[PDB]
Each structure stands twice: as C-alpha cells, then as structure tokens.
C-alpha cells in the first residue's frame, strides 16, 4: 500500500482545495473533481505544475510531485 500525498490546488481567485492522490493516480481524476466542485467545464481550465501543463494521464510519479506541492489552475480559457 503506497501512501497518499496531499496537493494544494490554487484557483484564479486564490481559493484552495487540497487533494489526496497516490503516486500512480492519473491526474484527470483530480482535474474532473476540481472542475465539478467549481461548477465549470473541465475543458475550460488548464492545470499547471511548476508552470507546465498537467496531462490527463500524468501521474504524481511522472511529475516528481511530493507532499504539499502546488497545482495552479488558469482559464484555458
């Protein structure tokens, strides 16, 4: 059993939602949940880690993410 890491997702308005994901989780699942909770279409948003686009099938392992890393959300637009 691998552990969850907790990521902070920062919106355009500086609001924050934190997500627990495993190192092998495909990050589309985070994107979909975030968009759902914001009440906007997932394709209206782009999700960045250190300024680089997060793909649907990127994993935290591929991106080298760790506990407390930040994802920023911008309009696609």
């Amino acid at each position: 059993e691998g552990e969850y890491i907790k990521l902070k997702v920062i919106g355009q308005d500086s609001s924050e939602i934190h997500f627990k994901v495993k190192m092998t989780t495909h990050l589309k699942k985070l994107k979909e949940s975030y968009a759902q909770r914001q009440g906007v279409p997932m394709n209206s948003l782009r999700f960045l880690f250190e300024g680089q686009r997060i793909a649907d099938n990127h994993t935290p392992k591929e991106l080298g993410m760790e506990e407390e890393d930040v994802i920023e959300v911008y309009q696609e637009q």
Binding site: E16, H18, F19, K20, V21, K29, S33
Partner: peptide, 15 residues
Amino acid sequence: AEERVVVISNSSSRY
C-alpha cells in the same frame, strides 16, 4: 474558508 481535503480513490449487473 475552512480547509477542504478531497480524497481521490459485472456478473451482478441487471442491465
């Protein structure tokens, strides 16, 4: 705002 943490986690079928 309060802290928000979200956890990202057929033979019986009838349709």
